Amino acid sequence: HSYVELKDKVIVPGWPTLMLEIDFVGGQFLNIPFLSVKEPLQLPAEKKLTDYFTIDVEPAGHSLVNIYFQIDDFLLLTLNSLSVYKNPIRKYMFLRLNKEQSKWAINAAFNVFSYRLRNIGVGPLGPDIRSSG
């Protein structure tokens, strides 16, 4: 198995968005627009995200970081349905923090305290923006 990149393409303008928010050890989080989606992500309130979703922050170089994750079939299937872009979620994927975002993870010793996915709705032109172009 490999870790495929979840590329920027998956964040389509106009549509709602799932924000990955990461709380490092220290206390002001780190916010990454994870995936644009047609409908909000609600999990069975029985369960929590950690059950289905595991992330690891590693350095990619002297100055950059990536976030790796492993997604269990349920969430995988759940995200793929919700996605605006055509079913882009594999079991093993990674995404690339930028030079800006990286600094934080480096300074935090890569040590994640907690994380969540969070639904962010659309803005005032959204409807018009998503249908245009």
Swiss-Prot record:
Post-translational modification: Not glycosylated.
Keywords: Host cell membrane, Host cytoplasm, Host membrane, Membrane, Viral matrix protein, Virion
Highest taxon of source: Viruses
InterPro entries per record: BDV_M (IPR032414), BDV_M_sf (IPR038520)
Keyword Membrane: yes
Membrane topology (UniProt): Peripheral membrane protein
Entry's Gene Ontology cellular component terms: host cell cytoplasm; host cell plasma membrane; membrane; virion component
Residue positions binding GMP: D56, V57, E58, A109
Subcellular location: Virion; Host cytoplasm; Host cell membrane
One family name in Pfam for this protein: Matrix_Borna
Primary site of residence: virion
UniProt-recorded Gene Ontology molecular function terms: identical protein binding; structural constituent of virion
Function, in words: Plays a crucial role in virion assembly and budding.
Quaternary organization: Homooligomer. Homotetramer. Interacts with phosphoprotein P. Binds to ssRNA.
Protein name as it appears in the record: Matrix protein
Lineage: Viruses, Riboviria, Orthornavirae, Negarnaviricota, Haploviricotina
